[PDB]
Symmetry: C3
Subunit: 318 residues, 3 copies
């Protein structure tokens, strides 16, 4: 009967269309390269005021070289003119009543205990220690550099998909609305401008610059390179997203080492709180390939061939 | 004959069970994301004694920012108060008999030869050089900071599988037996505590803290995120492993730059030996997908369909 | 007719050979690990002359620890003995006629404007600023350290394919023609020597050491680990390539902080131009697997089964 082939032909049309659209949607004919090879060069620009000091890129940015992870220092604690010696620790956790509770068995690790219980002040009695004196008092409150919100981060990112040897950069003057020197990334108005406003990045990550600068934190500027290398070079485009990674705070210690004319050594101990920026470059490209196209083909051919049998059994049996 | 279908039905039962278990074991129905996106923040805590000095996190940890690669300095060589000028190199390799063998053709690279053969000491005669004087003597023996074995490394790791947008952290209070502030990673007792004892890490890597601190080395704290994103969020868990990567030693040079009241410059040249720690975050997730499930399906369907024919030929023919 | 099976047998021979060679060529029977886990330790050696100074590894290499990204400083701009205060900016862009155009609305960001229009020199009138004085003059011309071309970069790279737990290093004495201490990488003569001549690396990237050292730049030493883990351990070999990533220049600012006997602070501000080296380790391994071998098998079986039908229709119909 002719209807049998009109039923089978309709079966093949519909089923093959479902299968066809499904496989065509997931790019099942594409080999995928998920090992992007990225290079990131960052440059921060701006100046702020902290205490009665002016902070420039050499004062608050660390490291200086412009790596994928850098820190803009917003608040810091200074302990000036430390020198090796003996002094009573100011931390209450080191409180003692006699030299019998200042032995090595107490607080394993941490500073060096001399073994004497000494009077840091009139209100506290702590174990004496050998080290940089006086000791640090990290419980005080200090200001924060507010101008850091208005600093700009310029991110140059140069990636390459090695499986296809397709390399490209994120400096795209045609895609930017304004000049490169004066543009400013906006997810909607200028999403390809490589210049980011620090405060903007803080907003895109859903963070308050006040609290963040106060406690420090870790934000991620995410550069995504989802690309179809079957399409034009113009189609491989970076997409920027932002996130807070510590989800607290972020601080680190470093000293400025000075020496006296008589040769003795003394440092300025600095506890730095700031916003660390981690440029995280993800990317995956898909290029047409014979092998995935053949495997997907056999899959769709056989799958339709079974679906028509099952549909005949489900339809005819009913 | 009915037995023919009882033979075929048994064929399908057994063969389909083998195939079924095989494909089900390898998660052939899963798409895999092998491009983990990790952020690592490390913090070292402890204090040691070297010479008649006390070393704190600001003295032996470099860099200070808490990156994925950092160095705990255990031994160092100091050459204090160097100044630009001329002096005889102390390295024997520069030995000379006359100014005729101190020309640019000799030892290309390395220091700057003035062209004069001068007497470094009474027992050695070396080419004179222009540079930081006096020259370094890197053949002496120095102590090592033993307290560095008892230092603790706290590793905060925040990763994300972008193909599935599944992000998670390694701070898991429910998985840790003890408090986060006081716990200590143990592969068996507390394998999810983010606080690692330096000496412990040295043991897990099969290394002697004595020899390692003496010669320096490169160890890797490996964080693995093998996850089945078909299962619960609770099931995606990090697994820590450890390894020595240099498999010798590790050292680097840096100077402390001082200036005189009259303006002349002089530095303290420091050759640092320590234990560099590289946090290596691997991970791959598998989530159910229609495409891999269909491809594997067709594969198992056809494979059984051929195995039954071949088994009929092998069985019936015999 | 026997010819029908001689036609079919020839069909299967030819078609199956095409399919067979195609699938065998792309290693369709292999699972692939594209998430290499690499560790990179770099060491630069050499000395240069800049001004009347001698630069050693402690002077021009930054950072010192030997990471995968480092910088060899070739040219720099020094602004010595800066101190917080007020002074007229030397940048023409800050030119003013009266204090009415030195308000916060002008040049948002950048230095701190006091609000006064002052005379930097007799030929220029600029807004006065609070900060490190005097201000920097980054428009002068300075020499470049030519010896940096002859420096050597030693790259120790230790990678691991985690999916197969196959770890290996790039120090291969058997593959190197000369001794490790004296060899020198040459793409043809010694392509496995880990010691690279800076000038050589500059040539392999198609760059002029003169212009590059003058303006600075970003080069990439690419280490590729394409490996067939079905073959011998000896067959997994690294291949080095080179590229310029900025495709201008590269510079960064850092200061040397000094303190006076009376306690006031003053720094030497340094703008550094150099060649940043980024070690980019790519790699992917392929190991025989049952699942990819079965999927490819079904694909080739079915594909031949359809090609023979289509070829019968194309041949017989004609
Ligand atoms: N907020 C910002 N506003 C303006 N410029 C900013 C900003 N942040 C970073 N930059 C960098 O500043 C460089 C131009 O400097 P410019 O502001 O005109 O002059 P300055 O006198 O202030 O100092 P400079 O030229 O940086 O030494 C560009 O170099 C690069 O990135 C730009 C660059 N570029 O934009 O062309 C490409 C590049 N690579 O690698 O392709 C590297 C740069 N870099 O490292 O600065
Ligand atoms: N051996 C160690 N013992 C105790 N604390 C240690 C140790 N190593 C590192 N830390 C970090 O120390 C922080 C708590 O400091 P705590 O010891 O209580 O106070 P201190 O007065 O000694 O100095 P501090 O608070 O660090 O400035 C925590 O912050 C963090 O990691 C912890 C942390 N945390 O544990 O909650 C989360 C975090 N991120 O990003 O989520 C970053 C930290 N960090 O950078 O230190
Ligand atoms: N152009 C170069 N010529 C000669 N040696 C150079 C050069 N660049 C770097 N190096 C490193 O120099 C080390 C040997 O030093 P050597 O030149 O003999 O002695 P020096 O007195 O000059 O100073 P040093 O031993 O480095 O403190 C080796 O250590 C290592 O890499 C080698 C090394 N190695 O070559 O055996 C293995 C290693 N890891 O991790 O396996 C790390 C090294 N490293 O960090 O220097
Ligand atoms: C950032 O720039 C805006 C623009 O004029 C300014 O109003 C604001 O005060 C600046 N932020 C700080 C902290 O000075
Ligand atoms: C950028 O714009 C110019 C227009 O002058 C065009 O010729 C060029 O092809 C464009 N490049 C890309 C990558 O779009
Ligand atoms: C160097 O002088 C300072 C005070 O100027 C003093 O505290 C120190 O003890 C002196 N050096 C030595 C080794 O005594
Ligand atoms: C490390 O801690 C243990 C615990 O008391 C102590 O016995 C040992 O001396 C410490 N190590 C060093 C080098 O002091
Ligand atoms: C952690 O423990 C609490 C128990 O108070 C539980 O409610 C929570 O769901 C747990 N979270 C995870 C991720 O296991
Ligand atoms: C500065 O003084 C030191 C000794 O105090 C001396 O060696 C040096 O020559 C002086 N500076 C100059 C430029 O001579
Ligand atoms: C590099 O080495 C060669 C080899 O002798 C030498 O001729 C050349 O002058 C050196 N380069 C510089 C900048 O000195
Ligand atoms: C290196 O050479 C030696 C020859 O003495 C040989 O025994 C060894 O197997 C070789 N190793 C490799 C990895 O080729
Ligand atoms: C310290 O001395 C310098 C000159 O030697 C001077 O400029 C400065 O004002 C002095 N310190 C203070 C706080 O005045
Ligand atoms: Mg304290
Ligand atoms: Mg020497
Ligand atoms: Mg300027
Ligand atoms: Na298939």
């Amino acid at each position: 009967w002719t209807i049998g082939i009109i039923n089978r032909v309709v079966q093949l049309l519909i089923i093959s269309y479902f299968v066809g659209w499904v496989f065509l949607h997931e790019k099942a004919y594409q080999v995928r390269d998920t090992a992007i090879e990225s290079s990131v060069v960052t440059k921060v620009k701006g100046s702020g005021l902290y205490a009665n000091r002016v902070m420039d890129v050499s004062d608050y940015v660390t490291p200086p070289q412009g790596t994928s992870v850098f820190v803009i220092i917003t608040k810091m604690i200074v302990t000036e003119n430390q020198m090796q010696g003996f002094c009573p620790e100011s931390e209450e956790k080191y409180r003692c009543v006699s030299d019998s509770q200042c032995g090595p068995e107490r607080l394993p690790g941490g500073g060096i205990l001399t073994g004497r219980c000494v009077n840091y002040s009139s209100v506290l009695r702590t174990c004496e220690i050998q080290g940089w004196c006086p000791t640090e008092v990290d419980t005080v409150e200090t200001p924060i550099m507010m101008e850091a919100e208005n600093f700009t981060i310029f991110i140059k990112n140069s990636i390459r998909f090695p499986l296809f040897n397709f390399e490209k950069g994120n400096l795209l003057p045609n895609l930017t609305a304004r000049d490169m020197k004066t543009c400013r990334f906006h997810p909607d108005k200028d999403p390809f401008c490589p210049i980011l406003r620090v405060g903007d990045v803080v907003k895109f990550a859903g963070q308050d610059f006040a609290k963040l600068a106060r406690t420090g934190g870790v934000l991620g500027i995410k550069i995504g390179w989802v690309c179809d290398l079957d399409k034009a070079w113009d189609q491989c485009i970076p997409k920027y997203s932002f996130t807070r990674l510590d989800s607290p705070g972020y601080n680190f210690r470093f000293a400025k080492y000075y020496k006296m004319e008589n040769g003795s050594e003394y440092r300025t101990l600095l506890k730095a709180f700031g916003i660390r920026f981690d440029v995280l470059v993800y990317g995956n490209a898909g290029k047409f390939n014979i092998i995935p196209t053949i495997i997907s083909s056999v899959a769709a051919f056989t799958s339709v061939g079974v679906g028509t049998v099952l549909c005949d059994i489900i339809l005819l049996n009913f």
